[PDB]
Amino acid sequence: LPPNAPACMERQLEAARYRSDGALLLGASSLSGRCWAGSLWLFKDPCAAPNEGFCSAGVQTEAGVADLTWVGERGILVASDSGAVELWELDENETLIVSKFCKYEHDDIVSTVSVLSSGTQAVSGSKDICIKVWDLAQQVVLSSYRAHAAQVTCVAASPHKDSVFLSCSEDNRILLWDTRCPKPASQIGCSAPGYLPTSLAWHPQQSEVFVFGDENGTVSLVDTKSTSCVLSSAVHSQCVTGLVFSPHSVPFLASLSEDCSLAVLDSSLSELFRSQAHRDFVRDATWSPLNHSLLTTVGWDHQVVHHVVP
Amino acid sequence: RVSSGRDLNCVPEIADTLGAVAKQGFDFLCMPVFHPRFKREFIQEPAKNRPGPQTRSDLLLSGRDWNTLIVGKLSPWIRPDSKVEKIRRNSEAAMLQELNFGAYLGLPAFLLPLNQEDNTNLARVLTNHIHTGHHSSMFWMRVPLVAPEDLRDDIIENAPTTHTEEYSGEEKTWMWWHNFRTLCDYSKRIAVALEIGADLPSNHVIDRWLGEPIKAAILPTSIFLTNKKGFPVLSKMHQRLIFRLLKLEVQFIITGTNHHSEKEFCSYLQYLEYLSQNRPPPNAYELFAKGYEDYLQSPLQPL
Amino acid sequence: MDNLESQTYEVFEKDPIKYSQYQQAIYKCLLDRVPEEEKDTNVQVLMVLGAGRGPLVNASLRAAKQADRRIKLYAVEKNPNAVVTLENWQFEEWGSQVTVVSSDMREWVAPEKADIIVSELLGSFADNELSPECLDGAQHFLKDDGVSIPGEYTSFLAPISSSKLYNEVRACREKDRDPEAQFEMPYVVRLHNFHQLSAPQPCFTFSHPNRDPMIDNNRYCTLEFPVEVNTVLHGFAGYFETVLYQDITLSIRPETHSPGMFSWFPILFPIKQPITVREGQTICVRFWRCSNSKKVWYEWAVTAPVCSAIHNPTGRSYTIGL
Amino acid sequence: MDNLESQTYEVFEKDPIKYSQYQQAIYKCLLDRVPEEEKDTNVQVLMVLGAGRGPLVNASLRAAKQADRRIKLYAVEKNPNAVVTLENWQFEEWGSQVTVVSSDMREWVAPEKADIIVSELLGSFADNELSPECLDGAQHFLKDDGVSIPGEYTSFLAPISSSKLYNEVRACREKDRDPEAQFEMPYVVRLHNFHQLSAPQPCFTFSHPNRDPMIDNNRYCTLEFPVEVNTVLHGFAGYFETVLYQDITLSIRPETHSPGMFSWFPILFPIKQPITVREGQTICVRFWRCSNSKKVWYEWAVTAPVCSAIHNPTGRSYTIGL
Ligand SMILES: O=C(COc1cccc2cccnc12)NC[C@@H](O)CN1CCc2ccccc2C1
Ligand SMILES: O=C(COc1cccc2cccnc12)NC[C@@H](O)CN1CCc2ccccc2C1
Ligand SMILES: C[S@@+](CC[C@H](N)C(=O)[O-])C[C@H]1O[C@@H](n2cnc3c(N)ncnc32)[C@H](O)[C@@H]1O
Ligand SMILES: C[S@@+](CC[C@H](N)C(=O)[O-])C[C@H]1O[C@@H](n2cnc3c(N)ncnc32)[C@H](O)[C@@H]1O
């Protein structure tokens, strides 16, 4: 174990993100027992995870980590239980992790963050029903939006536009945002209101399409232009917590669920793969940048699993 | 003076947090009894068999501290009235579990939201818990003066907020509570934790709540304005309401983060204690009648 | 948890349609399971579960000689007093084609699996006699392709006006118990001086055998009754329907009542306080079926046009023993 | 059927003598089962049955390091709230020497048989908390030569005079139940203003494990109390004794009370009507221990010098849930 690194890693793995160089970023919370905290980890050897002794870097955060994201190659943006959005900076040697800012701006658990396309701004979502736009350089909230009427579940930045992002709430709304508009949000989704939306991912190329997952295990594909739901599949038997597109030319979609399974789907939402490797909730997925058929999932079982995808 | 508590939805170490808030001036803390994100599963394998501990240990506080300093909070993922059957079932079981733990701990109070119209099943579960042993402890329903849906920003192009006249609609929230409490057969154990917002609704909506069992009033940091010297204070209107609530001797609860950054959390509190010390002293009748408020007597019959 | 009296079996054995209908159900089922070329070689194992004094055993025997097919019979009955009648039937008449078993169907360790179980464990609200729990604890001895007769049952509710019945319930206050307990239990009653406020709607449904990986018999259901006169709600009539086999059914739901069948009267779920409903309004009611390892009970509430108290929270006023 | 509160475990964990006595019982038993030459090679499997917050697990651990012998521990507890405390103890302290099991001991399918089960499931009248039924349903996972601690317990009764307590019972009438129900249930009470009319006599006795081919926990016993003053009988004090292991015992029977042990107060069995007894007369009483698959209860009557009504016929006023 490196200097500054904790001797032990929090049981509940929340997040897993490959940097472009191929190294693994892990976020983890302690959701039970005496101390309810969280930690951040960097693994230059991804196959060594989750063992704390074979990490490149590691650090304790005050509260749990509800969501994570890379800023650039050295920045780590954190959604905390504490109400805080925090930015952690990576070391020069990349052997320690250092708090750059901790802002107590949300009134409840911050549950979701996404980095906007430029890399200079981010949007966060909270149980406090707010959605906030951050200046990362300035360490301030530029815009604060109460669009929703129940806690916010997911916020996703568009692949290429700094002012466009999706959000979804327990108030049954999926909102397409565009901060260029006087009234920024616009309500989108299928004809009939359905089951609550629980996860969102933009298509990395067709910059006008996204998938969304609901609390009933259904993954659905939406077009913003034709403003209606095209395809849908019953993928999972429990709520869909994450959706991750592969880096591939025509991309695959990883689907992860509280049913403890991973699934991988093609463009038409047909099932190519499924993994029961996990024995608790599956919280994240990342595709190796180095090996485009390699996929990593983490769970609340403390497994870091590397899947080989056909 | 004023009995007041802190509402937190994040507690990394209970010992420390309780110390922090006590130092800050608070009489009690409202906090999760399970980690708010710690969604449990009760039927389907393998998550069902998730090794324990399911939460943090009772040994962490004295019996007395549990009895007097802590108010439980239902986990916010527990949705007994969801339209999805599997969520409804886990939620029933989860609610029982957290309810049973509060009782196991001996908590004096325990918070549950009414944050939508239909809480039939929440009511059914609570009523059941109520009739499973006879206990003293209170259930505070956390209801807002104004419903979230009627408080949102007018910022959806294709779903505008309706600016027309809605006498009945602006009372929707009272009906949420009315119905819940009717279903639960007016149990003396179920009281109101009234949530106050930046925008007070019409005065009539504050009329509704007049005779209701309000045991606590929740003040988000969000609603405080700032004076010249940067201290937190409240609009004239909000003061009027506080004064009404002081007369009813509710407990006050501060929720949310500190937004007046150059001040301690104790400054919000200091303002409240300022307001109560600055209320007109009770007249001679009010001193005599003091111990007797809503105490029912037989009329005297000296014949 | 109680044992039925001799005269209670007597009155109900007198039903024309109930048993004729079971005969026809057993008849069809045999034909579908043993082809003509197998008629003499295939002996179907038939189990009557809760056989009372035997009419279902006789109706099984008549079904097999009508199908011209061969059957072995087991007659399981837990009421040892009825087991007297059965055992005297099997010595005097049935001979060893029928094995009389005196035990609970949830307990009986069966010497072999069955082709078909036959049961009549149904109350006026279908499942209110615990037919689900009984058959669930038996099904482990039904063959993988086995048939349960009945295969299915469904309960129904309709709101009613009747101040007469309201008053009859109210008059059921007893000493030494909750003064409002009368109102938190269902009554079998031949509804007569009443007004039915809306068409019956399906409530709870059970299927047998139960192929659920996890079997759960608890239920929550929400019914919306469009009402188009002014009136006062005093309670809910319950009825039921069941699929014995295929198209052969039994019903006490008025729209599809089995003609001549007198074996079940309607059931009444009262409410503590009359509720005024206006023309054009919806009555919303909510029913739960609840359980312990010891007991099963219903809880109900009206949530529109106005709310009531939740009735029977916890089975405090009425449960059915397991 | 209920779950004990945190503060209830707290008060009772404070007993000096109860746990020290269990430590000593586990201590001796280990020595008798693993000889010095086996000390490092023989690891005894120990099961604490109803482990509450763990003091018996700690007392097991202290007994093994005092015996210098090796043990594997299972901590079975059905109160999931206490299972919280246990699971936090086993992560923070015990490590994997202790396997915490959250289930009912009658249900738990054990991965292996035990050398010794340890339990404290005893009420002021020994078996009135259903220690027999609990341990009976567990013993199938005790090895053939296995030891139960406790090995044995015995209840005792003595007749008492006390108009104070008679009056305290009478004052326990509640609305909505039998007006005399107060009198048909036993009270844990620190008997203070009372007169004990005769020496306690043994009542019911249980042994563990139970080597009976047919296990029956029901009992009928008849006690004759020679009385030598005039007075009025108002009830029966109960007490108990138990053999933890060999000579190591616990007792609340006054003649042999364990010094300093405050964990059990005496129990009171009232009677509906005071009965006058004269010097020289015998008080005859009769106690039954009764059961269902659902509940266990006592019924009692005085038959001399005059008769009383049979108390609690059927468990109509009080039962203990299974
Ligand atoms: O619908 C009714 C009618 O009740 C009665 C109606 C008329 C006379 C009765 C005499 C004794 C008992 N119940 C009577 N009872 C509930 C329902 O379980 C009826 N079933 C009908 C089928 C049946 C068969 C054998 C033994 C008992 C029964 C009871
Ligand atoms: O003899 C008594 C004394 O009762 C009490 C006496 C004094 C305070 C009490 C507080 C809470 C509950 N009971 C109390 N009770 C019956 C008997 O079962 C006591 N045992 C004693 C051992 C024990 C250990 C752990 C948890 C509970 C118990 C209860
Ligand atoms: C309503 S009766 C019908 C009797 C008979 N089949 C008839 O139609 O006349 C149901 C019978 O099932 C018996 N029974 C109910 N539950 C049972 C169980 N779990 N095991 C065995 N018998 C049962 C009852 O004692 C009763 O005689
Ligand atoms: C009186 S307490 C003693 C607790 C602990 N041994 C002590 O001395 O502090 C009995 C404990 O056994 C548990 N228990 C009772 N019956 C049980 C059963 N059948 N299976 C598992 N646990 C049981 C109770 O919940 C309770 O915590």
Side-chain angles (χ1 to χ4, degrees), chain C residues 1-4 8-10 12-14 18-19 22 48-57 76-80 82-83 86 101-108 118-123 129-131 133-135 138 263-264:
Chain C
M1 167 178 278
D2 296 325
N3 285 321
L4 280 179
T8 290
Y9 287 113
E10 184 194 30
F12 291 116
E13 285 157 5
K14 219 204 81 205
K18 203 189 72 156
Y19 302 108
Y22 266 90
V48 182
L49 297 195
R53 294 147 113 218
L56 251 46
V57 177
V76 184
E77 180 41 62
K78 58 90 190 171
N79 178 356
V83 167
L86 291 178
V101 178
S102 185
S103 90
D104 197 293
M105 71 174 73
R106 295 112 102 212
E107 292 306 301
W108 190 46
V118 176
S119 69
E120 197 287 78
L121 308 170
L122 292 190
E129 291 187 7
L130 276 29
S131 188
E133 289 72 17
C134 287
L135 292 180
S263 270
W264 300 275

Side-chain angles (χ1 to χ4, degrees), chain D residues 2-4 9 12-13 18-19 22 48-56 76-79 82 103-106 119-122 129 133-135 264:
Chain D
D2 296 325
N3 285 321
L4 280 179
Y9 287 113
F12 291 116
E13 285 157 5
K18 203 189 72 156
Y19 302 108
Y22 266 90
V48 182
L49 297 195
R53 294 147 113 218
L56 251 46
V76 184
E77 180 41 62
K78 58 90 190 171
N79 178 356
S103 90
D104 197 293
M105 71 174 73
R106 295 112 102 212
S119 69
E120 197 287 78
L121 308 170
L122 292 190
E129 291 187 7
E133 289 72 17
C134 287
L135 292 180
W264 300 275

Side-chain angles (χ1 to χ4, degrees), chain B residues 17-279:
Chain B
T17 306
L18 197 46
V21 318
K23 136 82 189 153
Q24 284 169 21
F26 292 106
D27 286 18
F28 67 96
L29 178 58
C30 319
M31 41 160 271
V33 280
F34 286 65
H35 190 285
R37 282 187 289 116
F38 193 32
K39 227 146 146 180
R40 271 97 65 203
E41 162 64 40
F42 291 81
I43 298 100
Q44 215 169 57
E45 265 159 357
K48 189 198 192 296
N49 301 136
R50 178 137 96 215
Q54 296 311 316
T55 185
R56 130 197 312 161
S57 170
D58 57 330
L59 291 171
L60 284 170
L61 294 181
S62 73
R64 167 171 302 300
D65 281 352
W66 285 121
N67 289 353
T68 46
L69 308 181
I70 309 285
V71 166
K73 298 171 91 208
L74 185 70
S75 295
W77 58 271
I78 292 162
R79 292 278 76 187
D81 284 286
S82 141
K83 315 247 73 86
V84 171
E85 198 200 282
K86 282 149 163 260
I87 297 181
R88 183 159 65 233
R89 292 194 190 273
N90 278 324
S91 289
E92 297 162 2
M95 178 170 175
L96 284 183
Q97 178 189 46
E98 304 189 349
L99 281 173
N100 291 335
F101 207 66
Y104 169 83
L105 296 182
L107 311 179
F110 196 102
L111 278 148
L112 302 97
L114 308 162
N115 64 21
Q116 61 184 50
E117 205 211 311
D118 179 9
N119 298 306
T120 305
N121 202 39
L122 181 93
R124 185 252 138 184
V125 176
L126 175 63
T127 305
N128 270 63
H129 170 72
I130 285 172
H131 292 98
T132 314
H134 266 272
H135 311 129
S136 282
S137 79
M138 302 294 303
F139 306 102
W140 295 350
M141 314 307 304
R142 173 163 192 165
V143 219
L145 280 165
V146 189
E149 189 55 52
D150 299 328
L151 220 42
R152 69 176 185 83
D153 295 342
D154 190 14
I155 60 167
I156 316 191
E157 166 264 328
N158 61 345
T161 58
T162 68
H163 268 274
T164 47
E165 174 77 346
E166 258 197 334
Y167 201 86
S168 243
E170 281 140 63
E171 285 161 11
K172 64 166 50 63
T173 255
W174 182 88
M175 193 66 67
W176 293 358
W177 154 249
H178 181 59
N179 291 354
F180 177 82
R181 151 202 74 195
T182 300
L183 284 164
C184 289
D185 207 0
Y186 284 84
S187 161
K188 69 182 187 201
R189 288 180 76 192
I190 300 166
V192 184
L194 182 70
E195 254 197 270
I196 307 165
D199 271 40
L200 295 198
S202 282
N203 260 28
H204 73 106
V205 194
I206 289 152
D207 292 350
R208 281 327 225 116
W209 295 105
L210 302 193
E212 303 294 347
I214 307 164
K215 275 318 191 171
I218 286 156
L219 308 174
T221 50
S222 302
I223 75 163
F224 290 81
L225 282 48
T226 335
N227 72 344
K228 55 207 88 161
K229 298 187 278 286
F231 271 106
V233 295
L234 292 162
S235 95
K236 300 299 278 178
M237 289 306 83
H238 289 74
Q239 309 182 76
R240 269 184 57 205
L241 177 55
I242 301 294
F243 286 119
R244 285 264 229 79
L245 294 153
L246 287 152
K247 257 265 133 60
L248 211 63
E249 325 180 17
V250 295
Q251 285 178 300
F252 292 88
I253 294 173
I254 317 276
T255 184
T257 45
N258 182 26
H259 289 135
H260 305 74
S261 199
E262 309 92 48
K263 305 279 196 302
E264 183 75 292
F265 271 110
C266 78
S267 68
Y268 293 101
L269 239 175
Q270 274 178 307
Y271 186 67
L272 290 186
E273 273 160 338
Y274 159 67
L275 255 38
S276 28
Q277 276 143 36
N278 272 227
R279 82 174 181 268

Side-chain angles (χ1 to χ4, degrees), chain A residues 39-307:
Chain A
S39 67
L40 306 167
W41 304 89
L42 181 56
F43 274 80
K44 266 143 176 168
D45 175 18
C47 291
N51 192 315
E52 311 79 30
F54 317 143
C55 79
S56 322
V59 73
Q60 202 71 24
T61 53
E62 49 166 4
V65 303
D67 202 19
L68 224 38
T69 198
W70 278 115
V71 194
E73 328 68 35
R74 280 200 183 89
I76 302 139
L77 186 68
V78 176
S80 168
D81 284 336
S82 61
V85 177
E86 52 200 8
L87 182 59
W88 290 77
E89 206 85 55
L90 207 37
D91 216 6
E92 198 71 71
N93 324 59
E94 300 191 346
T95 50
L96 67 74
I97 306 175
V98 57
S99 162
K100 184 65 191 180
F101 78 76
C102 186
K103 290 305 170 165
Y104 298 109
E105 271 293 314
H106 279 288
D107 285 314
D108 203 331
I109 295 164
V110 189
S111 58
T112 177
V113 295
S114 213
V115 212
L116 292 157
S117 58
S118 89
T120 54
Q121 301 177 325
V123 39
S124 52
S126 178
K127 300 205 185 295
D128 79 346
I129 314 165
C130 296
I131 286 176
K132 288 184 200 284
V133 172
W134 293 86
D135 194 343
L136 301 167
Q138 273 306 287
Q139 312 185 344
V140 285
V141 177
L142 307 146
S143 285
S144 197
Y145 305 112
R146 258 189 108 81
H148 283 292
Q151 44 169 256
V152 191
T153 308
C154 187
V155 292
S158 68
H160 307 300
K161 305 181 215 189
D162 247 32
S163 70
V164 173
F165 55 83
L166 290 158
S167 80
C168 73
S169 175
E170 267 164 15
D171 75 356
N172 219 358
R173 294 170 168 105
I174 306 167
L175 299 174
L176 187 57
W177 294 78
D178 193 339
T179 55
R180 289 170 305 196
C181 302
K183 283 178 167 199
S186 160
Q187 177 158 0
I188 181 145
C190 316
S191 302
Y195 290 113
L196 295 182
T198 55
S199 52
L200 318 145
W202 288 95
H203 199 273
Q205 285 130 17
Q206 304 151 309
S207 223
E208 331 86 341
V209 328
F210 64 98
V211 290
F212 83 96
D214 69 9
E215 70 186 340
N216 202 40
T218 295
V219 167
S220 295
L221 153 73
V222 190
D223 199 303
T224 58
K225 298 300 160 303
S226 53
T227 184
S228 209
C229 295
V230 336
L231 258 54
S232 68
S233 204
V235 184
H236 293 286
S237 70
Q238 298 249 67
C239 128
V240 186
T241 36
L243 298 157
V244 184
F245 279 112
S246 74
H248 293 256
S249 277
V250 52
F252 301 106
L253 181 64
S255 194
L256 55 134
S257 174
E258 286 177 10
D259 73 6
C260 284
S261 81
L262 153 68
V264 172
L265 320 150
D266 56 43
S267 63
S268 74
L269 272 30
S270 226
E271 186 186 328
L272 256 86
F273 189 56
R274 173 149 249 119
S275 180
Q276 264 93 56
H278 276 292
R279 60 202 173 253
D280 205 347
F281 300 162
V282 190
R283 302 267 95 194
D284 218 352
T286 22
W287 297 87
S288 171
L290 283 29
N291 190 338
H292 282 200
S293 276
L294 215 142
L295 173 69
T296 304
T297 56
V298 307
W300 284 356
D301 53 4
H302 211 67
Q303 282 190 109
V304 172
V305 181
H306 307 290
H307 309 259

